[PDB]
Amino acid sequence: MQDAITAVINNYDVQGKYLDGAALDKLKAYFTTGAVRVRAAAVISSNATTIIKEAAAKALIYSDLTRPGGNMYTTRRYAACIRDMDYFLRYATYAMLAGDPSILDERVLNGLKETYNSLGVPIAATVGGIQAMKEVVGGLVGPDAAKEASIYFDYLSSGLS
Amino acid sequence: MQDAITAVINNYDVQGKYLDGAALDKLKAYFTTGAVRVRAAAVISSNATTIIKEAAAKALIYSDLTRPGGNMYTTRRYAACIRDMDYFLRYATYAMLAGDPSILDERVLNGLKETYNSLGVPIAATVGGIQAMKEVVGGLVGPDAAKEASIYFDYLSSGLS
Amino acid sequence: MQDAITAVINNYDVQGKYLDGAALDKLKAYFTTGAVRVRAAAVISSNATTIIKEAAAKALIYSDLTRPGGNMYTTRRYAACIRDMDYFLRYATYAMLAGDPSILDERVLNGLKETYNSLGVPIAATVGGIQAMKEVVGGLVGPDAAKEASIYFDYLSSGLS
Amino acid sequence: MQDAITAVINNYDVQGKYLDGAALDKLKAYFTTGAVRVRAAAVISSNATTIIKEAAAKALIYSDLTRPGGNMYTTRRYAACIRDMDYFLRYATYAMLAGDPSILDERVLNGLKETYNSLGVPIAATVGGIQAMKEVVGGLVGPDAAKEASIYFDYLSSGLS
Amino acid sequence: MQDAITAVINNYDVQGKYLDGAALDKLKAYFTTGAVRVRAAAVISSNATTIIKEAAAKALIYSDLTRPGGNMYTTRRYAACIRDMDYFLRYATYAMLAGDPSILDERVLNGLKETYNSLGVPIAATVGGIQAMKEVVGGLVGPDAAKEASIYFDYLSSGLS
Amino acid sequence: MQDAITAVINNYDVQGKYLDGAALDKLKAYFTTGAVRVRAAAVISSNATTIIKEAAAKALIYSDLTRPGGNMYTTRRYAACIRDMDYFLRYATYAMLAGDPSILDERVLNGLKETYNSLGVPIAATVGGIQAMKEVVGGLVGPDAAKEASIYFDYLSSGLS
Amino acid sequence: SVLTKAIVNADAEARYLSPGELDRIKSFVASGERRLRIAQTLTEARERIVKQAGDQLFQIRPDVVSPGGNAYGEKMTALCLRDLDYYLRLVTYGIVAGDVTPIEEIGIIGVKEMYNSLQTPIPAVAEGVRAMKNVATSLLSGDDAAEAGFYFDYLVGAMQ
Amino acid sequence: SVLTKAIVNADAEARYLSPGELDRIKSFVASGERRLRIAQTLTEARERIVKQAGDQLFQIRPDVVSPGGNAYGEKMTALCLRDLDYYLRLVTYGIVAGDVTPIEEIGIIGVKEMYNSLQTPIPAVAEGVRAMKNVATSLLSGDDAAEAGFYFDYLVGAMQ
Amino acid sequence: SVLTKAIVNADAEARYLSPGELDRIKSFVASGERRLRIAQTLTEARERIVKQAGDQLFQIRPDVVSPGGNAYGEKMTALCLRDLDYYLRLVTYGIVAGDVTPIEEIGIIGVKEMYNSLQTPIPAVAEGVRAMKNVATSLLSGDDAAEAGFYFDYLVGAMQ
Amino acid sequence: SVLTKAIVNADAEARYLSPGELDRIKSFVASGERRLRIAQTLTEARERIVKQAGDQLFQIRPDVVSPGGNAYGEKMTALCLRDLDYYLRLVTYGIVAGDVTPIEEIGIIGVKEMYNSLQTPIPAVAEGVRAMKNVATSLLSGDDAAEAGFYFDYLVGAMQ
Amino acid sequence: SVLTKAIVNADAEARYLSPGELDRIKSFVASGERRLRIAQTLTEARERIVKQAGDQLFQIRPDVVSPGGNAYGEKMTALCLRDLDYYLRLVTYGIVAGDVTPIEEIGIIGVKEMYNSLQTPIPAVAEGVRAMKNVATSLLSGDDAAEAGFYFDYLVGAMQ
Amino acid sequence: SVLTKAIVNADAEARYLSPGELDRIKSFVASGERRLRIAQTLTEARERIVKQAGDQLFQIRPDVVSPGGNAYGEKMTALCLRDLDYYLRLVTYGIVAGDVTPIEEIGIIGVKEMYNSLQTPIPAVAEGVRAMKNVATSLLSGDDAAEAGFYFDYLVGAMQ
Ligand SMILES: *[C@H](C)[C@H]1/C(=C/c2[nH]c(/C=C3N=C(/C=C4\NC(=O)C(CC)=C4C)C(C)=C\3CCC(=O)O)c(CCC(=O)O)c2C)NC(=O)[C@@H]1C
Ligand SMILES: *[C@H](C)[C@H]1/C(=C/c2[nH]c(/C=C3N=C(/C=C4\NC(=O)C(CC)=C4C)C(C)=C\3CCC(=O)O)c(CCC(=O)O)c2C)NC(=O)[C@@H]1C
């Protein structure tokens, strides 16, 4: 994986360049937002379970999805689905701390679209589950962090569609 | 895998239906043939080795197959072939007990056609080895069980061709 | 794998033939060159490291390949490349002892072209690394063995291109 | 392990004796109590968690054991202790079904006394935890099964002391 | 392990001595008996099964050992016993080829006395099984090799008693 | 393992005490020496190989130990010995950073005395190898850190004797 | 089923069925009609069993239908009885299969995680199931009531 | 037994017995007296079963009692019937246990290796067992004869 | 601690500490006196924090102190505040260690199993901890209150 | 061969051939012409060796060519000598390769299972091979007869 | 970075970041501007550092620039300083990342094998790095010079 | 030896020695007296071989006996020839064993780590061994000189 800082280092390493003014400006733009990323992660982590619960309630359950014939019918599959939800939340929190989406590609999106096609897992319904968790997250983390958390949920959801 | 009984349960579960008259009639049609399936399995199991021997003798050996250039030439490959034969016999006995062919798909047919194409294993010759074991089986198990054993050998053989 | 001798045995086994005059002549043609193959292997083995060093020096390093943006840039990748070189040298020495290239197909070439395409490893540059090691080898092993060692390096290099 | 029935078979096998009248009487004495053993196991299994809870409440917690300096202080050790309790309950249920204590020796008591000495686990306190679960069990299973369940709890507890 | 030759090399290595006349004489005393050791091994290997059969027949079966209460009662234990016999025969053949008993200590005798005490395996009866295989071996291998094979069977048997 | 800080926390946890003045004074006594521990570790780590080389030169090699009959005779055993030396140096550096010897007991000393008795490894000679590395370390790290590094080398060496 | 369980153990050890395994298939299939009758009776009274289970439950645990209760309100109670209807259905499946394979994959594996998320008190779901045992069992002959009762006590067991 | 088999599977998955497992213990134990009667009858006629099995065997396979036969001679035949007596005994054990655990550890695991060493033709031992089935089965009611027959066919199966 | 965590990773990869690992030990130890002050303040007000946490808790969740509530009664409430006193103590330990090793082994690993047995509602224990954060945090400077707050939110996180 | 065996061990330990491995290749190849002569002589007399082996076999074991014998009859005997012709061929292959790799994959791995199915008595096949050793060995010089004899005794060994 | 290292440990244990891990990210990011200044100063003097490092090196080890030395000659010396320029660059990367991930993958993993092939004396490369520490460190404030020095001593450590 | 190597492979595959393995033991033992003569000649000239090897070495690589050289000085040179005496000894052992087992455990496994510590240039030790080959080989007949030469080239190979 890479973060903001190693994204820059590797981009310069392939050119064998010492870090110059443009590079140093990018890294500053990361460091200057760093404390806010940390606070936001502590809110998400400590509200993890409630975010999933409120996101499922707005976007998944009370529906045909949870009824016989639906993909989140059976305690087995309901458990698998909210298990997935926890992955998304947790990794988006990593991406936002790192200030780089590369981890969402390497460890979450790669092959996932076809995995879901192969099992029958409804893609559009999963995206709504992602964009509902974003909605909840953006309330809990506040002005400071709302836009920055949000983008990696949006990265996740356009990665499936 | 599934058997007669779980085939019905899962077909109703996806509709969230309690078992109704039509379901109950199907399950009866299985239970009412059950004792006969058991007796037939005990004959096959205890004559396993003789069935393979008589099936190979009628349909495989004394031929170009066992001669140099043939796929069951070498003690290695002769052993692999009658090993396979034992699988078929054994699994067909499972399918017939279960009263459902689903196990023959899940654990025997899936990928087997191409596996045989990739090794060079002669498909038509293998089918004759299956339909010869059926012939022997149908004699040994008697009127009671002949038709019921037979179908899962026929399932196996149209699964390859 | 197979060598000169088992190449002949298996070619006759599939016809179920005892070894005849033509077969016996082939095997003689191998045995009669055998002592020379052994001496050549002892030279290659004991000069292994120097052959790689001189082959890299003539065909790989002091170049864009070892500079930023190049595939053998970074100590990691430089190490991987000369590691590969050692494989080639070592296996070619096996092929030449066996008097059969079959091991170069089974354990070296199979899938390697696409593996290199997938990582970005430059094929043409790798061939030059092979044909430079051949050049060095042919000096060290002498008149006796030069042509025989050479062919399995040439087998390797037309296997990639 | 062995049960009532295999206890008899192995006792006769070493003498190479067919089962005689005395043997047949023993086996009857087991079969004739069999239905009651099954009912008792279904009560214990389905009340498992409540039995542990009531046994801990009467014999372990609200004490120095659960306070700092005590062996079931820390959520880690409290969890390990009631985990153990579940083993005892579960295995005693096996012994009582089998009508033979041999499984309690093979898979529970062997080395356990010294294991507890080595970790510092209080033996006397653990016995009270066993004899409290027995007390609860004997109420839940009723006249039919009380004495028979009880003995394998008593086997467990004199196995530690 | 060590053989005749490495026994000498390691005895001199610890003194840091080049091989001297006494050493060279010992090694000659091994090499000069070498061809005979090989022929003897080929007789034992190819008569392996018959040696065990004749050794068991003279020294183990037709007895209380094979009857109920006996240690080689049950097909399980009869199989384990003649399995053991094959180990002894096979390793003694290694020791005799090597001209050194060290392998019999490292891979056969170490802990075996107590292993047999712990399982109840009759030691004296096992020794007779060893000394019966020796008797058979000494007939089959002839004047050339009889004394040399014999000693490693005697090594085995005084290793247990 | 434990360090200065967790040594105090666990000593109070077993009494269920909040940290009091005496505890807080101990922790200060650690924190106040912390920066110096770090600098010392960076010197040891970066001079690791030279410390072993100078310690071996003063206390092990040029001796009967490295000659035939000696325990560090053979490249195998010489390698094992300086491998060990690296362990000691590395772990002592951990102990000194942690400000607690508990790791030296848990992961280095436990069973080591008898392990060395069983292999024949000379204990007194190993202690001199430890106390020579201490001597070198105390020069390299300077007034600030000399006494603090030294004690965990002394812990190691009275752990063997 | 009994069939699936026997076979899976057979195939996993690469062997034909044991005398034991064959015997249980035979005893099982002999009880077919009886097991089908037990499922029919209970299917036929499902609405009564659920409703009376639901009353028995809320007396014994009024806290779940109270201000801070998971089942507080008319539609939080409606879903609660629907879940009780689900489990009775699975119990009829189990009885006709002669084991839990189906009951398990459909409604116990994952059930802790599901209900923890919804914050449903698991042990009071176990009570709702005991309540159904009591009602269902009063509509069956002694012998059939016991046979049914094993499957009720299993579900009660698995929510634990 | 049926008990041992059920429990071992329970303990290995770290769990209490299933409804299925409980049911088979119940059906098994109900057949206790019947199974004990089946063993008694056969124990009571052991000498007849063995002897008549031995005649049926040597007609069907006279080669084993011939110059180059494993059972050639009076005392090579005496040991052969003794082995037939062994297996009938194990069959009575199996019937009262309701599975093969005991039959298996005592007389099939290792049997190939034992008889290969002695050079005994295994498939003619399987015939001796079929012969015993035929005799034993003629001393039992239809229902009990089948129940016994499963265990005979198992041994015949394992020597294969 | 920070030390234990760094070292364990070092030893497990058979190596000396990284520049990174060395840096964090240095930054950590520089915050020593401050971290010790944060623990002192909170130790000094423990009885107030617990009591006011306990009021804040029972307003927000009156159901736990009600007929069918885990903490219903005077001595079921006394033990509940004692558990709140336990967790505040562990939070002071964590703050002075600079990580959770100690907090974790003492009071989260096994906590689900412990409280499930006692039938304590876990998420309302998490609320009791939030309540303590609110009180404790009002006795600390902005910077120290945040540093403390991370450890409170961890415990809240682990009970989940 | 000797080559294949040496190399496979080399590659599996990721290394060039040892002095030992190189030495045996050298000694082996020096015996090339001799080994080729040994195979030629035996190839040249194959029909005699097989036929005289077949007589030697049926005297020593007349039971296989008797009513209940695997090789009883004219065409059950024809296939039996054909199998003896197969193994002599494999023995010539082994001698020119200097090890058993080829002999093994072609005619011993799987041979127990093949012949058990056909119900062929394995140990009398081993006798047929000893019989061929005796004939073949009488057409070779002392030194060449021994070198050949090792490969005959191997096959005899593997059928065991 | 510090970020990458923290996260990788988080993901590998399937969990959110610890209070400790969060704290170090916070302390690290606070040192951002300072770390960037340390890299700038050294980037700004790279040619001086390399050249003066190269003089300091060849005095201390004149053997590498002598007849049988790896760096003997004008262009064998030119490549040697270029390698010293490479490592200074990697040191600036490490300082801004707050750990070695980047330094390691780019220039220590595989470095033994690379230089052994080229027959470069590794320990004199370690000396060239000490020489750069000495120069670079004389262009930085005490506090920044130490922070830089850890990364120089790491490289010196890894070539060992 | 050849014996040890053959056997270890035999035991590890749970089998008797192959025809191949038996053949090499036979060819090996036939060369016994010759191999013993090769070791004797070289043992008899050890002091000459070492000394002349040492001159040949220092001409070809004068840098090791120079200011910054590992073997610089009279007693740093004395130890260097002693190491050359060690390896010649091991070469005599290898020749009489017919493989490297002994040579390997005594003087190549661990040799990189030993000499790296002492900072001895490994490739110039390999040169010292080539130098010994040249001298030793001039005291042996063509055939014996080659047989010896394989073991010299092995050591040269292993220091690589
Ligand atoms: C003669 C010494 C013994 C004997 C032999 C016998 N063999 C058969 C039948 C077959 N034998 C083989 C053998 C091989 N196939 C191979 O690929 C190889 C490796 C080169 C061997 C050794 C095969 C394949 C058959 C089947 C016939 C066919 O070729 O298709 C029989 C006939 C048995 C039958 O039931 O038809 C006999 C009699 N018989 C003895 O008793 C001797 C011990
Ligand atoms: C209050 C916020 C919640 C609550 C708590 C409550 N707890 C208990 C009983 C116990 N709690 C513990 C807790 C611990 N033991 C430990 O070692 C640690 C780690 C430091 C902790 C946190 C223990 C051991 C007990 C058992 C009593 C004992 O100490 O022996 C009760 C009583 C329950 C009962 O059945 O007796 C209560 C009420 N109650 C709530 O509802 C809140 C959510």
DSSP line for I48-63: HHHHHHHHHHHHH-GG
Q: Which CA distances in Å does C47 have to C52, C137, C154, L128, L156?
A: 9, 9, 20, 15, 8
Please tell me the distance from the alpha carbon of residue D132 to that of residue D55, in angstroms, as a whole number. 5
C with L: touching (≥3 Cβ pairs within 8 Å)? yes
Q: Which CA distances in Å does D136 have to C80, D48, D130, D148?
A: 67, 10, 10, 14
Q: Which ligand is nearest to the CA of B68?
A: 1
- Alpha carbon of residue G127 to chain centroid: 12
Cβ-based contacts of I105 with chain D (< 8 Å): 74, 76
Q: Which CA distances in Å does B100 have to B13, B30, G3, G4, K97?
A: 18, 10, 11, 11, 61
Q: Residue E2 — left, alpha, or beta (φ > 0 → left; ψ -120 to 50 → alpha)?
A: beta
Between CA D153 and CA D161, with CA D156 as vertex, the angle to 5 degrees is: 125
Resolution in angstroms comes to 2.5
Please tell me the distance from the alpha carbon of residue K142 to that of residue G36, in angstroms, as a whole number. 87
Residue with tokens 């930085």: K140
Please tell me the distance from the alpha carbon of residue G62 to that of residue L99, in angstroms, as a whole number. 85
| Residue C13 touches chain B, beta carbons under 8 Å | yes
Its domain, for residue G159, covers 1-160
H or E, element range at L86: helix L74-97
Its domain, for residue C110, covers 1-161
Q: Which CA distances in Å does E88 have to E82, E92, F57?
A: 10, 6, 50
CB A39 within 8 A of CB A149: no
D53 lines ligand 2 (CB under 6 A): no
Looking at chain L, the residues that come just before a C–N gap of over 2.5 A are: none
Answer yes or no: do I3 and F3 touch at CB < 8 A. yes
Listed residue (I34, A142, I15, A47) closest to K27, CA to CA? I34
Helices (H) and strands (E) in chain H, counts: 9, 0
Listed residue (G18, B41, B94, B43) closest to H151, CA to CA? G18
Ligand 2 atom 12 nearest Cα:
I83
Give the CATH number, domain containing residue L28. Answer: 1.10.490.20
Answer yes or no: do K117 and C56 touch at CB < 8 A. yes
Q: Which CA distances in Å does A148 have to A25, A35, A99, K8?
A: 19, 12, 8, 21
Q: Which ligand is nearest to the CA of J110?
A: 1
Q: DSSP string of F72-130?
A: T-SHHHHHHHHHHHHHHHHHHHHHHHHT-SHHHIIIIITTHHHHHHHHT--HHHHHHHH
What is the SS3 assignment for J98?
coil
Please tell me the distance from the alpha carbon of residue G151 to that of residue G128, in angstroms, as a whole number. 14
Please tell me the distance from the alpha carbon of residue K90 to that of residue E146, in angstroms, as a whole number. 73
Please tell me the distance from the alpha carbon of residue G101 to that of residue G106, in angstroms, as a whole number. 9
I71 lines ligand 2 (CB under 6 A): yes
CB H154 within 8 A of CB H107: no
Amino acid identity for residue G116 in this structure:
N
Both tokens assigned to I89: 């103590």
Looking at chain J, the residues that come just before a C–N gap of over 2.5 A are: none
What is the SS3 assignment for A121?
coil
To test ligand 2's pocket by mutation, which of I65, I83, I85 has the most ligand atoms within 8 angstroms of CB?
I83
- Lining ligand 1 with CB less than 6 A are B 61-62, 66, 73-75, 78; J 64, 69-71, 76, 79-80, 83-84, 86, 106-107, 118, 120-121, 124-125, 128
Answer yes or no: do A69 and B15 touch at CB < 8 A. yes
| Residue K45 touches chain A, beta carbons under 8 Å | no
J63 is in an annotated binding site: no
Both tokens assigned to A132: 């509902």
Report how far apart the first and last C-alpha atoms of chain L are (Å, whole number).
23
- Alpha carbon of residue A22 to chain centroid: 28
- Alpha carbon of residue F152 to chain centroid: 5
Both tokens assigned to D84: 């153990």
In degrees and rounded to multiples of 5, residue E18 shows phi and psi of -60, 155
Please tell me the distance from the alpha carbon of residue C34 to that of residue K84, in angstroms, as a whole number. 50
Please tell me the distance from the alpha carbon of residue J141 to that of residue B128, in angstroms, as a whole number. 51
Both tokens assigned to C148: 């025989």
Answer yes or no: do G153 and D46 touch at CB < 8 A. yes
CB I94 within 8 A of CB D29: no
Listed residue (K39, K21, K49) closest to K147, CA to CA? K39
Q: Which of residues 62 through 121 in chain B touch C, CB cutoff 8 A?
A: 67-69
- Alpha carbon of residue H20 to chain centroid: 27
Report how far apart the first and last C-alpha atoms of chain A are (Å, whole number).
23
Give how many domains chain H has, as a whole number.
1
Cβ-based contacts of H108 with chain E (< 8 Å): 75
From B46's Cα to the closest Cα of chain H, the distance in A is: 4
* Burial of residue H100 (number of CB atoms within 10 Å: 0-12, 13-18, 19+): buried
CB D1 within 8 A of CB D102: yes
Answer yes or no: do G106 and A76 touch at CB < 8 A. yes
Cβ-based contacts of K121 with chain L (< 8 Å): 121
Cβ-based contacts of J68 with chain H (< 8 Å): 61-63
CB K36 within 8 A of CB A24: yes
* Contact partners, residue G147, CB within 8 Å, separation at least 6: G34, G35, G38, G95, H23
Both tokens assigned to I133: 């954060």
* Contact partners, residue D73, CB within 8 Å, separation at least 6: D65, D66, D67
Q: Residue A140 — left, alpha, or beta (φ > 0 → left; ψ -120 to 50 → alpha)?
A: alpha
Residue with tokens 């170490």: E110
Q: E-assigned strands of chain G? A: none
Please tell me the distance from the alpha carbon of residue J80 to that of residue J97, in angstroms, as a whole number. 26
Question: Closest residue of E to L97, CA-based?
Answer: E5
From G3's Cα to the closest Cα of chain I, the distance in A is: 35
Give how many domains chain D has, as a whole number.
1
What is the SS3 assignment for B38?
helix
Listed residue (L17, L19, L18, L24) closest to L2, CA to CA? L24
To test ligand 1's pocket by mutation, which of J70, J122, J159 has the most ligand atoms within 8 angstroms of CB?
J70
Please tell me the distance from the alpha carbon of residue B116 to that of residue B122, in angstroms, as a whole number. 7
Please tell me the distance from the alpha carbon of residue G118 to that of residue G113, in angstroms, as a whole number. 9
Binding residues of G: 70, 80, 82-83
Question: Closest residue of C to B72, CA-based?
Answer: C14
D91 lines ligand 2 (CB under 6 A): no
Please tell me the distance from the alpha carbon of residue B29 to that of residue B148, in angstroms, as a whole number. 13
I94 lines ligand 2 (CB under 6 A): no
Cβ-based contacts of I149 with chain A (< 8 Å): 42
Ligand 2 atom 3 nearest Cα:
I80
**Within 10 A of E140 (CB to CB), how many other CB atoms are there?**
17
CB B35 within 8 A of CB H146: no
- Alpha carbon of residue D37 to chain centroid: 14
Report how far apart the first and last C-alpha atoms of chain C are (Å, whole number).
23
In degrees and rounded to multiples of 5, residue K26 shows phi and psi of -70, -45
CB D36 within 8 A of CB D144: yes
Q: Which ligand is nearest to the CA of J109?
A: 1
Q: Is the dihedral of CA E15, E20, E24, E25 positive or negative?
A: negative
- Alpha carbon of residue J1 to chain centroid: 15
I53 lines ligand 2 (CB under 6 A): no
Listed residue (E39, C94, L6, L20) closest to J102, CA to CA? L20
Both tokens assigned to I34: 């401050």
For residue I128, the ligand 2 atom closest to its alpha carbon is 2
* Contact partners, residue H78, CB within 8 Å, separation at least 6: none
From B79's Cα to the closest Cα of chain J, the distance in A is: 5
**Within 10 A of I77 (CB to CB), how many other CB atoms are there?**
16
* Contact partners, residue I132, CB within 8 Å, separation at least 6: I49, I50, I53, I84, I87, I88, I91, I152
Give the CATH number, domain containing residue B11. Answer: 1.10.490.20
Q: DSSP string of chain K?
A: -HHHHHHHHHHHTTSPPPHHHHHHHHHHHHTHHHHHHHHHHHHHTHHHHHHHHHHHHHHH-GGGGSTT-TT-SHHHHHHHHHHHHHHHHHHHHHHHHTSSHHHHHHHTTTHHHHHHHHT--HHHHHHHHHHHHHHHHTTS-HHHHHHHHHHHHHHHHH--
Please tell me the distance from the alpha carbon of residue I137 to that of residue I131, in angstroms, as a whole number. 10
Q: Which CA distances in Å does H28 have to H36, H98, K56?
A: 12, 7, 91
For residue I64, the ligand 2 atom closest to its alpha carbon is 41
CB L32 within 8 A of CB E37: no
CA of C21 to the centre of ligand 1 (A): 29
Q: DSSP string of G112-129?
A: HHHHHHHT--HHHHHHHH
Please tell me the distance from the alpha carbon of residue J60 to that of residue A20, in angstroms, as a whole number. 94
Please tell me the distance from the alpha carbon of residue G121 to that of residue G114, in angstroms, as a whole number. 11
- Alpha carbon of residue D157 to chain centroid: 8
Binding residues of C for (2R,3E)-phycocyanobilin: 62, 66, 71, 74, 76-77, 81, 84
Q: Which chains touch G (3 or more CB pairs under 8 A)?
A: A, B, D, H, I
Listed residue (D63, C77, E152) closest to K107, CA to CA? C77
- Alpha carbon of residue D54 to chain centroid: 16
CB L24 within 8 A of CB J24: yes
Experimental technique behind these coordinates: X-ray
Please tell me the distance from the alpha carbon of residue L146 to that of residue L157, in angstroms, as a whole number. 16
